[PDB]
Design a protein around this ligand. Structure first.
Ligand SMILES: CCC(O)(CC)CS[C@@H](C)C1=CC[C@H]2/C(=C/C=C3C[C@@H](O)C(OCCO)[C@H](O)C3)CCC[C@]12C
Lengths: 238, 10
């Protein structure tokens, strides 16, 4: 029935998210300007992602138990999950009204063509939009949204993970917190198979991560493009 | 060898 601890965890994650996600998107002004004219959107989105990586890291540090992991394991989980959590957290600005990420203003409203102008092909973009649509359809409570991002970050099967046993215990605690929350706090019919559908989204993310990595390597392949990214992005995305 | 990421996690 959601123990004191599980309610504590949810409270920590909600505040953690509130401290790392500014719905006013005021900081977007610091990013190199978006250019909607080849790769004209790369500088702007690169900065957006670099900013987003910084936010995801801040969120992750506040995940109950994440601090108990080794420095190396913490690094491994962030490198592998960063793109996934950014895709997940972006659902908050994504709007089905026109299938775009609406970040406050027209300048900061991105659609398929903008992602296209960042160096990506439809093979990533379509399933990415598809993902956003399916996640939006779940109409998750904010409690479920933050729990899913935390569960994504603390995955024991990530390549390079060392104390896989420790990662699991941390994640299981967050999973059991989510499962129980859905039962006791998410009324039917919306709760129908909600947990299973959310886990399926993590599977979709693994697929998106894999395809993003391939197109990132093609893009970052040529120094002229790799030159337009940020140092944090270069370090995290390989 | 992840300077920046590690610094941000400290
Ligand atoms: C530039 C080339 C590059 O591959 C990255 C190397 C990325 S493009 C592409 C695959 C992609 C990953 C997620 C996508 C997007 C996410 C956008 C948001 C906006 C807002 O919700 C932020 O919240 C702000 C509040 O904190 C999120 O965090 C981030 C939409 C445009 C394309 C992005 C940036």
């Amino acid at each position: 029935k959601l123990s004191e601890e599980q309610q504590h965890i949810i409270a920590i994650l909600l505040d953690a998210h509130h401290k790392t996600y500014d719905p006013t998107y005021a900081d977007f002004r610091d990013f190199r300007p978006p250019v909607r004219m080849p790769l004209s959107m790369l500088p702007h989105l690169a900065d957006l992602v670099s900013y987003s990586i910084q936010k995801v890291i801040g969120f992750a540090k506040m995940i109950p138990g994440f601090r108990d992991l080794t420095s190396d394991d913490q690094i491994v989980l962030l490198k592998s999950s960063a793109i996934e959590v950014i895709m997940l957290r972006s659902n908050q600005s994504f709007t089905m009204d026109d299938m775009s990420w609406d970040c406050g203003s027209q300048d900061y409203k991105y659609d398929v063509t903008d992602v296209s102008k960042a160096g990506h092909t439809l093979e990533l973009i379509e399933p990415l939009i598809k993902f956003q649509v399916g996640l939006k359809k779940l109409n998750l409570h904010e409690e479920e949204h933050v729990l899913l991002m935390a569960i994504c970050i603390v995955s024991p099967d990530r390549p390079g993970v060392q104390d896989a046993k420790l990662v699991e215990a941390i994640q299981d605690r967050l999973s059991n917190t989510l499962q129980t929350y859905i039962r006791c706090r998410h009324p039917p019919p919306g709760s129908h198979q909600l947990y299973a559908k959310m886990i399926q989204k993590l599977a979709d993310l693994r697929s998106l991560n894999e395809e993003h990595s391939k197109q990132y390597r093609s893009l970052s392949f040529q120094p002229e493009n790799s030159m337009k990214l940020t140092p944090l992005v270069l370090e995290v995305f390989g | 060898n992840h300077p920046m990421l590690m610094n941000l996690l400290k």
